[PDB]
Design an enzyme around this catalytic site. Structure first.
Site, mmCIF file in Angstrom:
data_model
loop_
_atom_site.group_PDB
_atom_site.id
_atom_site.type_symbol
_atom_site.label_atom_id
_atom_site.label_comp_id
_atom_site.label_asym_id
_atom_site.label_seq_id
_atom_site.Cartn_x
_atom_site.Cartn_y
_atom_site.Cartn_z
ATOM 1 N N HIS A 18 0.763 -1.249 0.000
ATOM 2 C CA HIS A 18 0.000 0.000 0.000
ATOM 3 C C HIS A 18 0.790 1.293 0.000
ATOM 4 O O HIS A 18 0.196 2.357 -0.123
ATOM 5 C CB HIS A 18 -1.004 0.020 1.157
ATOM 6 C CG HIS A 18 -1.932 -1.149 1.156
ATOM 7 N ND1 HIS A 18 -2.843 -1.390 0.148
ATOM 8 C CD2 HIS A 18 -2.083 -2.159 2.046
ATOM 9 C CE1 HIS A 18 -3.516 -2.494 0.424
ATOM 10 N NE2 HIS A 18 -3.076 -2.980 1.572
ATOM 11 N N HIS A 121 -2.946 -2.311 7.906
ATOM 12 C CA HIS A 121 -4.045 -2.694 7.014
ATOM 13 C C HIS A 121 -4.593 -1.464 6.324
ATOM 14 O O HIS A 121 -4.760 -0.419 6.953
ATOM 15 C CB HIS A 121 -5.144 -3.420 7.816
ATOM 16 C CG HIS A 121 -6.435 -3.611 7.079
ATOM 17 N ND1 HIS A 121 -6.625 -4.615 6.154
ATOM 18 C CD2 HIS A 121 -7.616 -2.953 7.172
ATOM 19 C CE1 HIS A 121 -7.866 -4.556 5.697
ATOM 20 N NE2 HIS A 121 -8.487 -3.557 6.300
#
Ligand SMILES: [Cl-]
Length: 128
Positions: A18, A121
Site C-alpha cells: 500500500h 491494514h
C-alpha cells in the site's frame, strides 16, 4: 526503525501492498507482479488480488494517520485529509504471472488499521 516484534511483518506487508509514493496509474501489473512487489491474495498460492490500492505518499506521512493526522473510526482510523491513491482493479488472471489490472487515480480519505502506532491494514472499498 525499531518496531514491536508482533507488528514487524504486518507493517512490512502494509508497506509492500500500500505504500507507493512513486507509483503511477499505468504500472499496476509491473508493480504487483513477480518482477517487483509480488503482491498476492492472502491465503492463496500466488493468487491475484481483486483489488490493491497504492497510496501515493511516503511511509512517514502515512504513519501519521495512525496518530495526529487521523481520527477514530471503530478500531480503525480515517485520515483527516485525503490522499492521492492508485487503485489497481483486477482485469484478468488467476495467479502470477498473469495478474492484469486497470489503475485509476483518485483523491480519497484513507482508512487504516494501526497497531501500536504502525499501519498494518488498508481498508479497501467492498465493491471496486
Ligand atoms: Cl477523519
Amino acid at each position: 526503525h525499531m518496531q514491536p516484534e508482533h507488528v514487524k511483518e504486518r507493517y512490512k506487508n502494509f508497506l509492500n501492498q500500500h505504500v507507493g509514493p512513486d507509483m503511477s496509474v499505468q504500472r499496476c501489473n509491473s508493480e504487483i507482479g513477480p518482477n517487483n512487489r509480488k503482491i498476492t491474495l492472502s491465503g492463496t498460492d500466488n493468487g491475484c488480488k481483486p483489488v490493491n490500492t497504492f497510496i501515493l505518499a511516503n511511509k512517514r506521512l502515512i504513519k501519521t494517520v495512525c496518530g495526529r493526522a487521523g481520527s477514530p473510526q471503530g478500531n480503525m482510523v480515517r485520515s483527516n485529509q485525503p490522499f492521492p491513491v492508485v487503485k489497481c482493479v483486477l482485469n484478468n488472471g488467476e495467479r502470477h504471472p498473469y495478474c492484469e489490472y486497470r489503475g485509476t487515480r483518485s483523491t480519497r480519505y484513507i482508512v487504516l488499521k494501526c497497531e501500536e502506532g504502525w499501519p498494518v491494514h488498508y481498508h479497501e472499498d467492498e465493491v471496486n
